[PDB]
């Protein structure tokens, strides 16, 4: 059996990797919770690395957070997650760990990228500035496993998510990201026969969106086709891929859909006096279906079985 | 007397401030050997720093190289770098040094940026593939700077240099780095009574050049400026420096000047089926003018001081 360290693993997408690795006869769970595991501390997992005898790592350990939280703490968005990177990289490099995948985020794109923003579209301009310090971390990930790729004959392969949804988020009306708030600001106002729920904006924006264990599912995908084949669709310089379903939906008809997963009978209402965004945002995924794996989970249906999760997790 | 520790100090450019800060009797010089500290060693640098009561860092020490080096070494360029600037402003911040100086690098800026390079030009575009994984440790340096001075309210600035020359360079042909490898050059043509020295390309391209003494009062002026000066000429998340003369010369002139200091009395000869590199590359020092500092070091002067000093130390 392959012994396979999940880091993060108690993480929305780390869980998701483990949920469906567990099932599998051919490998061996390597997992570490963070009281146990300190992946800020150098010496700590440069020890982890010697005594374990891993063969393969899912780097999911990450410093995440919303809009506010990007903002406020920008140090620790920039610092903890350049650690981390760099201790499991240089750790799994030292004890002959060949196959590592890097998973990122989609906040490393430009703000004003081409849509939809193929792999190319990374460095091509600024950055959004909330995020800039966390994607600035994102991106030296990449450059790591790029560079110990091209130095030392490593494997460190590397996929970037699109926004995410699924089990394990964070379900509470003030998340900045848009499927858990909602799912919890209708949840709540079905509780109340809330007569209507005010969304700010137009809701003419277009996003893209999938669920976290289709991410799962590409990422275990990502990690175990031939290194030929993962060569033909990258290059060494440019190796990262991009998860997601390469189709956008308007939060228009994302908040009329959770409305009607949810129940609730009220009314979805949009105040278009305060700004939207960009009128499109979302990633192009030739290489991943170049690659072999197309996304299983529909909007409706994972937004359903998100629901269940949620109501079943109180 | 204010504390300083000098991070890098035998280096070109650590030393160059050195030099100028050992004449400061309102300083007390702080430094290390690499013997004595190795920066990349986290809780090594944290017990520095807890134990020397140190008022000012200037970050001066990094794994540099040339073009052969940054291609060969990739995750050594990335890697190193990452973990000394992490390591030292982290144990700045944990023990309550407020004012720091990074001193970065012009790989930073696109490979086709705006001419001349104003700090804006960050970010803006694709970076050069030979030194990518170098600069992007070099930005998340600025950035680690920048996240601590906005969540915490620090004091830690930043310098980015154009092409440097001086006492303390590499003097060897093989050198990537045009001062330094012809100065050698034409040193060893004109003791060889060469006929001539061949350089390749057509010698139109124009690149900009600074003392590092020039740069080392750059730097000291840069980090004692009231905060409330460099605050109005600085911004929060676009804080760095540029640092330079902000004038052109074609490498033919430089070659020709060269050839001139060393007493050369064969021909300079340009191969031009060879190619050139960008026809124009310097950075905009209008910040750092504004700022009120101008350079003080001409090329011919500098030169041949510089090649006084490579004459000295054979
Ligand atoms: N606040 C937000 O809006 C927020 C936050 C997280 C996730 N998300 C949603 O989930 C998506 C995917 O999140 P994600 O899975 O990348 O993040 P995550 O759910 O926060 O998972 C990161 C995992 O890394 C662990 N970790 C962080 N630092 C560690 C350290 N020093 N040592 C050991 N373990 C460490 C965390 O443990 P600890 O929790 O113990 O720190 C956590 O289990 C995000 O894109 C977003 O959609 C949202
Ligand atoms: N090969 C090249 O072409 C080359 C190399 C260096 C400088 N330069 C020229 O000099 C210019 C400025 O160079 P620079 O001053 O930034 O570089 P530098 O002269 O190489 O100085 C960097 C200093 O940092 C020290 N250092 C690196 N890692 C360390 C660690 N782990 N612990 C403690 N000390 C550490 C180095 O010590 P150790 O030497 O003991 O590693 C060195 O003293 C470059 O732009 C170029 O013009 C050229």
Not at 20 to 38: A, K, P
């Amino acid at each position: 059996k392959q012994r396979v360290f999940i880091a993060g693993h108690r993480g929305m997408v780390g869980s998701a990797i483990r949920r469906q690795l567990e099932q599998r006869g051919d490998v061996e769970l390597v997992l570490r919770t963070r009281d146990e595991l300190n992946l800020l501390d150098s010496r700590a997992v440069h020890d982890f690395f010697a005594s374990e005898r891993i063969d393969q790592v899912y780097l999911a350990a990450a410093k995440v957070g919303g809009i506010v939280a990007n903002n406020t703490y920008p140090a620790d968005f920039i610092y903890q997650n350049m650690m981390i990177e760099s201790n499991i990289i240089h750790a799994a490099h030292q004890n002959d760990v060949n196959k590592l995948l890097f998973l990122g985020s989609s906040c490393i794109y430009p703000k004003l990228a081409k849509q939809p923003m193929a792999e190319s579209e990374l460095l091509q301009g600024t950055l959004e500035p909330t995020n800039e310090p966390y994607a600035i971390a994102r991106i030296a990930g990449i450059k790591l496993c790029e560079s110990y790729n091209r130095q030392y004959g490593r494997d460190y392969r590397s996929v970037m998510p699109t926004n995410l949804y699924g089990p394990h988020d964070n379900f509470h009306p003030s998340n900045s990201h848009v499927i858990p708030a909602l799912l919890r600001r209708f949840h709540e106002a079905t509780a109340q026969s809330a007569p209507d729920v005010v969304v700010w904006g137009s809701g003419t924006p277009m996003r893209e969106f999938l669920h976290v264990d289709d991410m799962a599912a590409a990422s275990i995908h990502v990690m175990e086709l031939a290194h030929e084949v993962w060569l033909e669709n990258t290059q060494p310089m440019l190796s990262h891929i991009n998860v997601g379903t390469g189709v956008d939906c308007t939060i228009r008809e994302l908040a009329q859909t959770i409305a009607k997963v949810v129940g609730y009978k009220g009314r979805v209402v949009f105040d278009a006096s305060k700004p939207d965004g960009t009128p499109r945002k979302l990633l192009d995924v030739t290489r991943l279906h170049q690659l072999g794996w197309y996304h299983e989970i529909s909007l409706e249906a994972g937004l359903a079985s998100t629901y269940q999760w949620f109501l079943e997790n109180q």
